[PDB]
């Protein structure tokens, strides 16, 4: 019942959201073959659907 | 009758803040046509003092100096001065009776009691009723005060009539339920008054039961105040013509700068065996004829009118920001959204030396044609107007920006700019700033949709 | 028949430079007078002189 | 400073890659080859700030 | 009399008569109470026009009589015009939430927001668009917001009214969202603005010298939340001598007839009162006429 | 139809083909060979 | 006076309302216009 226990890694437009949400990773260019294990935790345009 | 009494009581209501005394007016077919009177949306009017600035802006000075700055991003001063110029005018009451009538007969059909010095049979083709309040700053009043009128049709057009208050209060101050007493007292005299340019006259009424008659103002008309009020009106008129002066000295500068070997920037087939000494001589004879026929209704004034709008300055900044960017990266094109100047509306001055008939305002849609296409100038209907084939014409082209082309027949052109830095800013707005649409009857609430038919309070039908 | 095509590089040279001298001499005799402000100003000033 | 940070990080240069194989690499391509030996198995990690 | 028949021009396939039996105990506005009508005067598509106005639709929908739909037979559909005070079943289609003991009235179909556009009876050049059956709080809110948005939009440039409309056009009621498509200034709208101005100024004349200064006396005495909320706008605006109570009675009676005439400009007649609702909210029984 | 059928070609490989059609120093036809017409698809993830 | 072209050889046209032709005023009409511009002032 706090707000967020990691405010560098939760906001829309933080460091971790621009590093691991797959939309901005496509906007930076990345190997799709590399499995990143945090991609399942920041794919917020897929869990929103 | 309908607006005169109401706005009289309304100026009695609002007299405390701005001491505006009513001027009850009627117009006729000399002011405007019947079609223009049937669809007149609303009227704007402006009080401007003997010093000649405004009644809306600041008393001493303004942020409207620093003459033009010749910019595209601000391009006048930004939109704060546009907000100022919107705050200058006021929206006065308004009523149209589009049916032929005799005025004293019509006030006899109403409850008003008419008595003039001598019977003047006035007969006009329709009637539009308008009241104006000129603002005396103190209780006293200056004779060299001047007014402005604006008549707005729903297309966005405007007509400006301007005149001094000296001719409005010349004879009047020298001789000098409430709705039931107002009809019983009624009018004292009827007076026609021309404007400052003698292009249109209009009639004013004078009621004895108005609250103007008991205010006891003082009236003085000093000649040095009249001398400066025409000087302020001089610069107001001169904003249109010294801009045309600024176009002509630009041509003479760049031609001396180039040296007489001007290039081609327009697509025309040519013929080498045709003489060109005859073509150069018809450049000089026709260029002065354009200055002989200069007018506010011209292409270079229509080039400025979209730039002095509300959302013009921010969109102009958005234009260069879209250009001045990096090339799309390889990561961008595969996953970014799809990224967006085909043809532009140019305005044209067509002069013709064979018959001395010069056309001032012309819509031209021009675009780059393929295979190193310089420029080609089509009409609104793809007509490809083909005046610049003929030897008898010369044509001037302007852009929505301040870019400028003077084109000889055969499509040979002179590419230069438009300099307005000699022009100040506050006279640049009030002549031709693009005013915004204000919502009225039959208007959609949201900004722009399929608009319905016009109101058209006309005389062909019944009112209903 | 006989027509050239509208390229970019094709120009129109000076008309033996004396007509451009005539344009400059037309400018220097255009400079004195012909403002079109003063006709409107003495019109309105003679109107207010007559009233 | 890129040369120094590649020296300090252990990862070598991007070897002046072809301008068409960037579209390959954004389409998806396996890049990092195997090691010489593995007595444990495949590696796995990620990072958050 | 009450049973009127509507014939069709196109033929009937099985899916169309199936969609008709899906509209048993629906509601369709009919003009003139004719004994026999074509399907072109059926529904609302003969009068719908985008960019023509929501207010004229809200007016002339209320003037057409209402009926229910039952007993399809083939190349004809039976409409039974309801009588006053009798208990009928109504199947709604406008997805607004219904509760028991609640009053209902009819608004023209404001589009829902995804633009579902569910014609729910397909033809070539005509669709059976259905009137909305909306409970009285939401419909009264729609009327009040339409009148307010009509009144504010006079003598205003597009930017400020656009900034106020993009908030004001939205409305929620039991987890829903609605907009208003065609809110234009109409002649009926302007004559209702005229009626509102005359009646509200007549209220302004018929106030006594104590009921104008009652709220200042409460702001002197107490300090509550609604007191501060009213007093804030009230300050943004800015012992009794003679008490003849019969004159205050007459002043309040005039003020009462003027507030009824003001309130009638947004509040319609209640045309359906529910009795019980099915929990899936697709049909409910109602006791009133159309 | 250009803005229409692009709105169904939204995936990465389609725009990668669009990039490779313009990222050559050559022209189109020397990189293009025809294969024929499809008559049955199997709806995989890499569809047969 | 004479122009400096780019192409060495001129071509023909077909008199469309699309191709921008040069004026057809061979030898008399241009003399008429120069006499006109002489007598206009």
TrEMBL record, chain C:
It comes from the Viruses. This is UL77 protein. The chain holds residues 13 to 63 of 642 of the full protein.
Automatic annotation (TrEMBL), chain D:
This is Major capsid protein. It comes from Human cytomegalovirus (HHV-5).
Automatic annotation (TrEMBL), chain E:
GO terms for molecular function: structural molecule activity. Keywords: Capsid protein, Host nucleus, Virion. It comes from the Viruses. It holds the Pfam family Herpes_V23. One of its GO terms (cellular component) is viral capsid. InterPro entries: Herpes_capsid_2. This is Capsid triplex subunit 2. The gene is UL85.
UniProtKB/TrEMBL annotation, chain F:
This is Capsid triplex subunit 1. The gene is UL46.
């Amino acid at each position: 019942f706090a707000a967020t226990h990691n405010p560098w890694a939760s906001q829309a437009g933080c460091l971790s959201d621009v590093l691991y949400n797959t939309r901005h990773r496509e906007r930076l260019g990345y190997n799709s073959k590399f499995y990143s294990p945090c991609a399942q935790y920041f794919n917020t345009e897929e869990i929103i659907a | 009758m309908e607006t005169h009494l109401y706005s009289d009581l309304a100026f009695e209501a609002r007299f405390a803040d701005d001491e505006q005394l009513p001027l009850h007016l009627v117009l006729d077919q000399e002011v405007l046509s019947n079609e223009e009177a049937e669809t007149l949306r609303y009227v704007y009017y402006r009080n401007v003092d003997s010093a000649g600035r405004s009644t809306g802006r600041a008393p001493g000075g303004d942020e409207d100096d620093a003459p033009a700055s010749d910019d595209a991003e601000d391009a006048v001063g930004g939109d704060r001065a546009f907000d100022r110029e919107r705050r200058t005018w006021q929206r006065a009451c308004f009523r149209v009776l589009p049916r032929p009538l005799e005025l004293l007969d019509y006030l006899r059909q109403s409850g008003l009691t008419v008595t003039l010095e001598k019977e003047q049979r006035v007969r006009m083709f329709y009637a539009v009723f308008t009241t104006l309040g000129l603002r005396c700053p103190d209780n006293r009043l200056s004779g060299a005060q001047t007014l402005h009128l604006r008549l707005v049709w729903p297309d966005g057009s405007y007509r400006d009539w301007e005149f001094l208050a000296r001719d409005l209060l010349r004879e009047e101050m020298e001789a000098n339920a409430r709705t039931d007493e107002w009809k019983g007292a009624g009018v004292s005299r009827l007076r026609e008054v021309w404007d400052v340019q003698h292009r249109v006259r209009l009639r004013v009424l004078w009621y004895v039961n108005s609250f103007w008659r008991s205010r006891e103002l003082s009236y003085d008309d000093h000649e040095v105040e009249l001398y400066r009020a025409l000087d302020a009106y001089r610069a107001r008129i001169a904003v249109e013509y010294v801009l045309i002066r600024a176009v002509r000295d630009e041509i003479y500068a760049v031609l001396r700068r180039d040296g007489g070997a001007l290039p081609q920037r327009f697509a025309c087939h040519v013929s080498r065996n045709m003489s060109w000494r005859v073509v150069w001589e018809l450049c000089r004879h026709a260029l002065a004829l354009w200055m002989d026929w200069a007018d506010v209704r011209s292409c270079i004034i229509k080039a400025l009118t979209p730039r002095l709008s509300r959302g013009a300055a921010a969109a102009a900044q958005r234009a260069r920001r879209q250009r001045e960017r990096s090339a799309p990266k390889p990561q961008e094109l595969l996953f970014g959204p799809r990224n967006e100047p085909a043809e532009q509306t140019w305005y044209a001055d067509v002069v013709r030396c064979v018959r001395a008939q010069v056309d001032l305002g012309v819509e031209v849609r021009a675009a780059r044609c393929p295979r190193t296409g310089l420029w080609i100038v089509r009409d609104r209907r793809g007509r490809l107007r083909r005046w610049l084939s003929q030897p008898e014409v010369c044509v001037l082209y302007v852009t929505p920006d301040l870019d400028f082309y003077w084109v000889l027949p055969g499509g040979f052109a002179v590419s230069s700019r438009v300099t307005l830095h000699g022009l100040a800013q506050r006279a640049l707005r009030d002549r031709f700033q693009n005013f915004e649409a204000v919502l009225a009857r039959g208007m959609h609430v949201e900004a722009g949709r399929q608009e319905p038919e016009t109101p058209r309070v006309s005389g062909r039908r019944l009112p209903f | 028949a006989v027509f050239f095509e509208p390229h970019e590089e094709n120009v129109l040279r000076c008309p033996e430079r004396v007509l451009r001298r005539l344009l400059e001499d037309a400018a220097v005799t255009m400079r004195g007078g012909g403002w079109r402000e003063d006709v409107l100003m003495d019109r309105v000033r003679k109107r207010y002189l007559r009233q | 400073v890129d040369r120094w940070i590649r020296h300090a990080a252990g990862v070598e240069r991007p070897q002046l890659l072809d301008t068409e194989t960037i579209s390959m690499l954004t389409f998806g391509s396996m890049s990092e080859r195997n090691a010489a030996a593995t007595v444990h198995g495949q590696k796995a990690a990620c990072e958050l700030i | 009399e009450a049973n009127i028949f509507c014939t069709f021009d196109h033929k009937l396939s099985i899916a169309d008569v199936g969609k008709l039996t899906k509209l048993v105990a629906a509601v369709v506005p009919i003009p003139q109470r004719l004994h026999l009508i074509k399907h072109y005067q059926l529904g609302l598509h003969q009068f719908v026009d985008h960019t023509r106005g929501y207010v004229r639709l809200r007016g002339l929908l209320r003037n057409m009589t209402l009926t229910l739909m039952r007993r399809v037979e083939g190349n004809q559909i039976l409409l039974h015009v309801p009588t006053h005070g009798l208990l009928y079943t109504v199947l709604n289609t406008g997805p607004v939430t219904w509760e028991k003991g609640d009053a209902l009235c009819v608004l023209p179909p404001l589009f829902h927001g995804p633009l579902a556009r569910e014609n729910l009876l397909t033809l070539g050049q005509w669709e059976l668009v259905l009137p909305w059956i909306v409970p009285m709080p939401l419909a009264l809110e729609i009327n009040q917001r339409l009148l307010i948005m009509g009144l504010f939009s006079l003598d205003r440039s597009y930017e400020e009214v656009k900034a106020a409309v993009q908030q004001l056009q939205t409305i929620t009621f039991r987890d829903a969202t609605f907009t208003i498509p065609d809110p234009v200034i109409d002649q009926h709208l302007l004559i209702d603005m005229k009626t509102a101005c005359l009646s509200m100024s007549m209220v302004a004349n018929l106030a006594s010298e104590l009921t104008m200064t009652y709220v200042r006396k409460l702001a002197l005495e107490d300090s509550s939340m609604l007191l501060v909320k009213c007093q804030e706008l009230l300050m943004r605006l800015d012992r009794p001598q003679h008490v003849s109570p019969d004159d205050e009675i007459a002043r309040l009676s005039a003020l009462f007839v003027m507030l009824r005439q003001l309130d009638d400009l947004i509040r319609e007649q209640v045309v359906f009162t529910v009795c019980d609702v099915s929990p899936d909210n697709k049909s409910a029984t109602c006791i009133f006429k159309g | 139809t250009r803005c229409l059928l692009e709105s169904v070609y939204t995936a990465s490989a389609a725009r990668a083909a669009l990039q490779w059609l313009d990222l050559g120093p050559h022209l189109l036809h020397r990189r293009l060979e025809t294969l024929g017409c499809v008559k049955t698809v199997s709806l995989g993830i890499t569809s047969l």
